[PDB]
Amino acid sequence: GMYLRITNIVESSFFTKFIIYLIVLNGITMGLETSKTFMQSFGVYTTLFKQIVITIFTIEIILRIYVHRISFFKDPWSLFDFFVVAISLVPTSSGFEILRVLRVLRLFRLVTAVPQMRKIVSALISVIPGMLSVIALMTLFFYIFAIMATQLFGERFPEWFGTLGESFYTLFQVMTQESWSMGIVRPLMEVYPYAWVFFIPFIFVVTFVMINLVVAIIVDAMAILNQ
Amino acid sequence: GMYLRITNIVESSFFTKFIIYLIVLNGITMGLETSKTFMQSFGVYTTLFKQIVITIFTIEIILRIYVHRISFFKDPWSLFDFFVVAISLVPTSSGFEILRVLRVLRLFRLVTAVPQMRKIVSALISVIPGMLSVIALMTLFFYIFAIMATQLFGERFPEWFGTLGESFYTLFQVMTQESWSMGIVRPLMEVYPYAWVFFIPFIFVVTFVMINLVVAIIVDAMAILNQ
Amino acid sequence: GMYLRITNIVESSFFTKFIIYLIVLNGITMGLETSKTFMQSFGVYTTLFKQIVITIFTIEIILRIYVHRISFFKDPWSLFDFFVVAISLVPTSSGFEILRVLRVLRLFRLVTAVPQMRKIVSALISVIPGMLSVIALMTLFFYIFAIMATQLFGERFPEWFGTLGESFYTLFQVMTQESWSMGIVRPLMEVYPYAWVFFIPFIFVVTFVMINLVVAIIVDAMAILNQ
Amino acid sequence: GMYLRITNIVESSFFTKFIIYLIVLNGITMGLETSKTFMQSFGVYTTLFKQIVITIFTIEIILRIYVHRISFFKDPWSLFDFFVVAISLVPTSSGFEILRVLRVLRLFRLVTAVPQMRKIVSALISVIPGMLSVIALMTLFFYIFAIMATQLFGERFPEWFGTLGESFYTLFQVMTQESWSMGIVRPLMEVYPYAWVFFIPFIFVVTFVMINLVVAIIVDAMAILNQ
Numbered sequence: 028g029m030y031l032r033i034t035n036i037v038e039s040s041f042f043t044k045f046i047i048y049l050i051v052l053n054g055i056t057m058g059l060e061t062s063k064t065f066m067q068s069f070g071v072y073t074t075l076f077k078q079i080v081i082t083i084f085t086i087e088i089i090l091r092i093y094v095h096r097i098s099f100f101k102d103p104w105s106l107f108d109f110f111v112v113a114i115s116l117v118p119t120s121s122g123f124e125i126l127r128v129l130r131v132l133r134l135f136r137l138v139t140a141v142p143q144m145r146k147i148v149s150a151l152i153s154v155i156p157g158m159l160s161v162i163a164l165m166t167l168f169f170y171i172f173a174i175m176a177t178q179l180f181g182e183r184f185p186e187w188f189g190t191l192g193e194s195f196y197t198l199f200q201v202m203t204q205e206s207w208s209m210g211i212v213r214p215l216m217e218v219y220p221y222a223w224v225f226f227i228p229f230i231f232v233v234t235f236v237m238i239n240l241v242v243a244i245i246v247d248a249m250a251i252l253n254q
Numbered sequence: 255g256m257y258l259r260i261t262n263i264v265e266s267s268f269f270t271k272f273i274i275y276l277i278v279l280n281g282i283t284m285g286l287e288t289s290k291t292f293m294q295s296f297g298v299y300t301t302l303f304k305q306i307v308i309t310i311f312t313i314e315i316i317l318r319i320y321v322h323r324i325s326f327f328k329d330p331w332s333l334f335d336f337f338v339v340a341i342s343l344v345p346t347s348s349g350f351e352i353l354r355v356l357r358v359l360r361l362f363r364l365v366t367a368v369p370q371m372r373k374i375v376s377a378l379i380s381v382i383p384g385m386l387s388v389i390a391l392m393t394l395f396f397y398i399f400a401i402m403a404t405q406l407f408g409e410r411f412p413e414w415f416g417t418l419g420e421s422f423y424t425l426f427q428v429m430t431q432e433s434w435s436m437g438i439v440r441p442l443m444e445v446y447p448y449a450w451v452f453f454i455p456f457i458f459v460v461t462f463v464m465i466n467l468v469v470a471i472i473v474d475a476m477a478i479l480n481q
Numbered sequence: 482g483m484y485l486r487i488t489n490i491v492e493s494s495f496f497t498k499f500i501i502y503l504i505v506l507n508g509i510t511m512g513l514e515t516s517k518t519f520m521q522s523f524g525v526y527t528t529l530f531k532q533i534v535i536t537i538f539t540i541e542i543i544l545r546i547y548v549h550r551i552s553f554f555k556d557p558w559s560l561f562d563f564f565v566v567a568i569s570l571v572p573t574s575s576g577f578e579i580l581r582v583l584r585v586l587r588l589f590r591l592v593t594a595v596p597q598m599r600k601i602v603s604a605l606i607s608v609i610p611g612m613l614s615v616i617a618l619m620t621l622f623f624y625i626f627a628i629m630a631t632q633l634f635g636e637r638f639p640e641w642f643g644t645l646g647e648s649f650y651t652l653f654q655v656m657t658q659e660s661w662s663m664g665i666v667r668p669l670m671e672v673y674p675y676a677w678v679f680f681i682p683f684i685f686v687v688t689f690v691m692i693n694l695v696v697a698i699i700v701d702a703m704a705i706l707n708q
Numbered sequence: 709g710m711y712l713r714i715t716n717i718v719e720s721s722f723f724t725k726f727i728i729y730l731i732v733l734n735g736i737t738m739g740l741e742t743s744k745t746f747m748q749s750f751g752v753y754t755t756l757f758k759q760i761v762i763t764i765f766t767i768e769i770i771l772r773i774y775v776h777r778i779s780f781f782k783d784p785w786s787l788f789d790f791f792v793v794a795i796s797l798v799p800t801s802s803g804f805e806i807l808r809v810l811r812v813l814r815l816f817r818l819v820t821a822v823p824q825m826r827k828i829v830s831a832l833i834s835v836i837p838g839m840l841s842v843i844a845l846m847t848l849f850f851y852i853f854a855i856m857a858t859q860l861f862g863e864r865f866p867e868w869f870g871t872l873g874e875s876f877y878t879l880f881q882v883m884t885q886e887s888w889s890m891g892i893v894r895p896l897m898e899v900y901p902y903a904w905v906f907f908i909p910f911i912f913v914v915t916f917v918m919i920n921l922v923v924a925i926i927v928d929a930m931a932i933l934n935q
């Protein structure tokens with residue numbers, strides 16, 4: 028087509044720097060809205076601000092959808108950028124409260140826009156694929172010990188191991204090692220005195236696996252450097 | 255001998271993929287049996303399912319024992335695969351309850367069958383042999399401090415250090431650092447005010463050794479790469 | 482100018498070794514002043530000692546400012562060395578109590594003077610610049626989860642998430658993993674039973690990011706060695 | 709001189725393997741003596757055993773001192789081997805109870821005798837010298853924050869920060885992160901609401917330094933391999 032003009036504006040630096048400025052202003056706005064006193068004083072300016080920024084972001088997404096239609100929905104950053112826009116597009120009384128809490132995720136658009144942020148985030152995602160083998164191992168391991176722990180402690184201890192889900196949680200807690208013994212294992216042993224046969228091996232296996240996953244991360248990082 | 259036929263079926267992909275499907279179905283079954291309501295509704299279909307799958311697995315192990323007899327009992331994956339089959343072969347009322355909880359280990363047959371899982375598990379086992387020197391060091395160290403801590407705190411504090419085993423446990427807990435001070439050392443110091451001479455050095459030695467073991471894992475991994 | 486004499490004294494070893502000896506004597510002095518009994522016995526000798534050492538340090542800084550004026554205020558070690566001198570130069574009744582507690586920082590002048598200490602400290606500072614990308618990521622992440630957690634739990638749980646700052650703190654605590662579950666998440670779930678959807682993902686993201694930052698430190702260290 | 713005979717016996721394998729067997733027998737003995745029931749049954753055989761083994765070890769040390777006099781007291785393994793022998797040589801009623809608890813250290817003679825154990829222990833000691841710079845840094849840092857924390861919280865909180873030593877301990881506890889917040893910082897903030905300015909930076913500095921020390925261990929290990 029002005030199509031060259033609108034694609035030289037959308038891909039212009041000033042357009043994306045401007046929506047960056049709008050993102051930062053909105054983040055401060057969202058920070059201030061937690062103050063109940065600030066919300067008694069300037070509750071109207073901020074909400075009108077939120078409305079004007081949501082409309083700007085929606086037209087900005089419409090333009091970005093136009094200038095490169097096929098890529099926009101095959102590109103992860105813009106896909107997410109479209110989804111957080113959409114989630115906050117549904118009016119706050121049109122959705123459940125949880126939708127209004129998710130609206131906060133619209134600040135990650137700062138990670139979307141800032142290219143140093145893009146670089147680092149896709150670096151962490153890049154780490155993820157090697158870990159799949161040991162994540163699959165470990166979630167099978169957690170499933171098995173959830174099952175055994177439910178069937179072993181979930182009547183005398185229905186608070187912690189009564190369910191499969193409760194056992195998943197208490198096992199994750201034991202894995203992070205928080206309160207693993209004065210909190211879970213010792214009270215257990217007040218009734219089942221060989222409960223440490225279940226948990227001490229569990230601790231050993233889970234910690235060994237975690238260490239090895241970390242070392243794995245490290246060598247995958249280093250191989251691209253020694254080459 | 256059909257011996258070529260049965261060894262072209264046992265070593266066929268479909269046979270092992272089928273027992274993989276059976277393993278997954280059984281894992282979901284075992285997951286559902288923890289629900290007491292599901293067990294009131296469909297307690298019979300699942301138990302008949304468990305019986306038909308245990309017979310399939312037992313004939314599958316019999317065939318696998320036949321086609322390569324000598325290797326089957328000199329191969330770790332199949333050895334374990336035989337043992338978990340056997341453990342759940344003993345009827346649930348023929349054994350103690352703990353046997354029924356061990357039956358859950360039959361889901362690790364998924365690690366046995368899936369070759370990506372085999373690769374990663376034998377990778378972790380491969381890590382293990384280098385660690386033997388420092389494991390032997392450390393268990394001697396734990397034995398010595400168990401002994402000293404029992405003889406030092408196990409009358410005024412029989413809950414935690416009254417025995418050698420109780421001291422082993424409380425020392426392992428202090429090693430994982432859980433509640434090491436507000437939980438153990440400080441209550442101790444209410445009666446023995448120099449108890450930190452025992453535990454602070456213990457903490458230092460045990461943490462230093464743990465770090466060094468991890469670094470050791472790392473360099474053993476890296477040497478095979480710089481070569 | 483004696484200017485050559487005073488610059489051959491300031492840059493002399495004995496001058497800086499002497500202020501090192503004075504720094505150590507002052508550190509022991511500061512250690513002793515916490516004893517209330519020692520302060521009843523020799524409260525006067527130590528305070529006169531503090532006054533004579535502060536005057537020596539102030540003239541030492543005046544000389545060092547003279548011999549190389551332009552560099553002194555463009556050099557970090559001496560800049561800090563000037564600032565800790567100044568902070569304790571304000572009389573103890575001229576400032577708030579917090580100023581008297583900051584006076585203790587005058588012992589880091591030992592890190593300033595000792596060159597092995599300088600080497601190691603600037604080594605740690607040298608590590609810092611690479612971490613900026615992931616620190617910026619993470620503080621955005623903490624800001625977002627502070628906001629969501631305040632809006633989600635800060636009425637039923639005003640102690641922990643009532644404010645943005647309180648939520649920052651409780652989230653940092655959950656990040657260090659201290660008491661994350663028996664302390665925060667479980668009491669929460671007594672009222673909001675899906676609170677683990679908020680915290681378990683938070684734990685996962687924050688731990689993964691921390692691991693990756695550490696690995697990043699490591700590879701940055703190693704690249705200067707494989708080269 | 710038989711001097712060749714006694715030096716071909718002392719340096720014989722059988723002599724050192726025999727004292728290894730004696731060390732293991734004594735370790736089991738020491739383990740059994742914690743049982744009060746075993747001590748009612750066989751309290752005499754074990755004590756006579758302890759006496760016969762202590763005499764064997766003392767003559768063994770006398771022989772080892774003879775065959776190479778100058779080296780024995782310039783060699784760390786044998787020096788320690790001499791000292792643990794001496795500590796348990798003082799009769800149990802001739803010393804304080806703590807001496808009888810130290811007698812347990814005579815089991816580390818197993819690390820002294822076993823050469824794989826020697827290899828690994830001197831490997832860990834070998835790691836230690838590089839860490840000196842950051843240990844010296846850190847103990848200065850701990851001294852400074854002990855001082856500030858005593859002067860800041862040791863009247864309203866004399867249990868934890870009343871002394872310099874108590875503050876050292878509570879700071880070490882905060883460093884290991886155990887109960888750092890629900891245990892120390894939060895109760896503090898009930899009276900001093902900006903106590904997190906002191907501890908959150910302390911946590912950050914101490915953790916960063918710890919990470920860097922570990923990375924330092926790692927690169928020192930790796931440089932001897934890339935060479």
Ligand SMILES: CCCCCCCCCCCCCC(=O)OC[C@H](COP(=O)(O)OCC[N+](C)(C)C)OC(=O)CCCCCCCCCCCCC
Pocket residue numbers: 050051052054055058059061062063064065134137620621624644645646647
């Ligand atoms: C990216 C991270 C940057 C750094 C983040 C800084 C966060 C600062 C948090 C500290 C603020 C909270 C402390 C505080 O005491 O504030 C009180 C208010 C809420 O209480 P308030 O409503 O004042 O009290 C009500 C009294 N009542 C019930 C009797 C009527 O709470 C407030 O006043 C909230 C103050 C708003 C802080 C907004 C800071 C935004 C930082 C910029 C981040 C933009 C990144 C895109």
Ligand SMILES: CCCCCCCCCCCCCC(=O)OC[C@H](COP(=O)(O)OCC[N+](C)(C)C)OC(=O)CCCCCCCCCCCCC
Pocket residue numbers: 161162165166169190191192193194195196197199236237240674677681
């Ligand atoms: C590939 C990308 C990375 C992703 C990898 C992470 C994989 C996580 C697997 C989680 C699968 C389990 C999820 C699940 O089954 O949810 C169960 C519970 C929910 O409890 P629930 O019963 O809903 O609570 C309601 C309370 N009620 C009924 C009494 C009213 O919720 C929990 O208990 C969840 C607790 C955490 C589970 C962690 C499981 C092991 C993950 C291993 C991660 C690898 C580390 C090396």
Ligand SMILES: CCCCCCCCCCCCCC(=O)OC[C@H](COP(=O)(O)OCC[N+](C)(C)C)OC(=O)CCCCCCCCCCCCC
Pocket residue numbers: 166167170190191192193277278279281282285286288289290291292361364
């Ligand atoms: C490998 C890991 C994959 C992901 C694992 C997913 C785990 C999901 C766990 C969450 C389920 C538990 C949550 C929940 O509230 O369920 C309740 C039931 C038990 O309570 P229920 O019997 O319903 O209540 C009794 C009521 N009474 C006493 C008054 C009669 O508890 C249940 O309903 C159990 C539901 C069965 C979940 C089975 C999921 C299997 C995942 C596939 C793994 C196959 C790998 C080979």
Ligand SMILES: CCCCCCCCCCCCCC(=O)OC[C@H](COP(=O)(O)OCC[N+](C)(C)C)OC(=O)CCCCCCCCCCCCC
Pocket residue numbers: 220223227388389392393396417418419420421422423424426463464467
């Ligand atoms: C080579 C492959 C890797 C394997 C390496 C792991 C080595 C583990 C060594 C364990 C040896 C000690 C086992 C033991 O003596 O059991 C004692 C206690 C059992 O307590 P118990 O007295 O049975 O409780 C009954 C209560 N009662 C009598 C009052 C009714 O049970 C416990 O207290 C066990 C607590 C954990 C002990 C950890 C010992 C140090 C292991 C160092 C691991 C290396 C880390 C760097």
Ligand SMILES: CCCCCCCCCCCCCC(=O)OC[C@H](COP(=O)(O)OCC[N+](C)(C)C)OC(=O)CCCCCCCCCCCCC
Pocket residue numbers: 504505506508509512513515516517518519588591847848851871872873874
């Ligand atoms: C760099 C680190 C080196 C190693 C640091 C060593 C730190 C030693 C801390 C242990 C001392 C505290 C233990 C203790 O019980 O001392 C008590 C006094 C305070 O209580 P005190 O005033 O004696 O009791 C009052 C009784 N009343 C209320 C009834 C009248 O508290 C004291 O007596 C304080 C004793 C002063 C220790 C000064 C040590 C300085 C180490 C050298 C560091 C110089 C580096 C530049």
Ligand SMILES: CCCCCCCCCCCCCC(=O)OC[C@H](COP(=O)(O)OCC[N+](C)(C)C)OC(=O)CCCCCCCCCCCCC
Pocket residue numbers: 615616619620623644645646647648649650651653690691694901904908
């Ligand atoms: C580049 C050099 C390295 C530096 C990187 C560190 C960045 C730290 C960012 C901190 C920004 C947040 C500061 C802030 O907003 O302060 C809020 C609270 C203060 O609570 P406040 O409301 O003042 O308490 C008064 C109580 N009242 C009102 C009821 C009377 O104070 C807190 O809650 C602070 C708690 C710690 C916050 C940690 C935030 C995430 C940092 C991520 C660090 C990277 C790790 C991978």
Ligand SMILES: CCCCCCCCCCCCCC(=O)OC[C@H](COP(=O)(O)OCC[N+](C)(C)C)OC(=O)CCCCCCCCCCCCC
Pocket residue numbers: 393394397417418419420731732733735736739740742743744745746815818
């Ligand atoms: C290097 C590490 C190897 C593995 C270490 C194995 C450690 C085993 C610890 C578990 C034993 C303790 C469990 C237990 O219930 O034993 C009870 C006794 C003490 O209570 P007891 O005196 O039986 O009860 C008194 C009853 N009363 C007051 C009413 C008269 O406590 C005992 O019976 C103690 C049993 C002695 C265990 C000796 C094991 C030595 C392992 C070999 C290490 C040699 C390395 C050089």
Ligand SMILES: CCCCCCCCCCCCCC(=O)OC[C@H](COP(=O)(O)OCC[N+](C)(C)C)OC(=O)CCCCCCCCCCCCC
Pocket residue numbers: 447450454842843846847850871872873874875876877878880917918921
């Ligand atoms: C080169 C080879 C490696 C060695 C490096 C380790 C360096 C350790 C430095 C320790 C210096 C401080 C020792 C000290 O001053 O002792 C003070 C307290 C003793 O408390 P105390 O006042 O005796 O308790 C009596 C109670 N009373 C008076 C009320 C009846 O006892 C404590 O509080 C000690 C707590 C641990 C202190 C840790 C200090 C920082 C060490 C940094 C280690 C490096 C890690 C990166």
Ligand SMILES: CCCCCCCCCCCCO[C@@H]1O[C@H](CO)[C@@H](O[C@H]2O[C@H](CO)[C@@H](O)[C@H](O)[C@H]2O)[C@H](O)[C@H]1O
Pocket residue numbers: 230231232234235429430431460461462464465468922
């Ligand atoms: C079959 C598996 C073989 C068994 C061997 C595997 C090793 C398992 C060790 C036991 C696990 C307990 O794990 C426990 O975790 C805590 C976490 O605070 C460690 O505390 C840690 O401090 C520092 C700082 O992070 C770490 O760098 C270090 O790795 C570790 O010492 C304890 O030192 C460790 O003992």
Ligand SMILES: CCCCCCCCCCCCO[C@@H]1O[C@H](CO)[C@@H](O[C@H]2O[C@H](CO)[C@@H](O)[C@H](O)[C@H]2O)[C@H](O)[C@H]1O
Pocket residue numbers: 241656657658687688689691692695911912913915916
């Ligand atoms: C001026 C200094 C610059 C500031 C930057 C330095 C980083 C400091 C991070 C904040 C310190 C809190 O440290 C907190 O320790 C706990 C210990 O369980 C970590 O938990 C850890 O789990 C795994 C398993 O060990 C580690 O490999 C990982 O490094 C870390 O995530 C928390 O994730 C981390 O947040």
Ligand SMILES: [Ca+2]
Pocket residue numbers: 203204205658
């Ligand atoms: Ca932890």
Ligand SMILES: [Ca+2]
Pocket residue numbers: 204430431432
């Ligand atoms: Ca821990």
Ligand SMILES: [Ca+2]
Pocket residue numbers: 204205431432658659885886
């Ligand atoms: Ca902990």
Ligand SMILES: [Ca+2]
Pocket residue numbers: 657658659885
């Ligand atoms: Ca921790």
Ligand SMILES: [Ca+2]
Pocket residue numbers: 431884885886
């Ligand atoms: Ca810890």
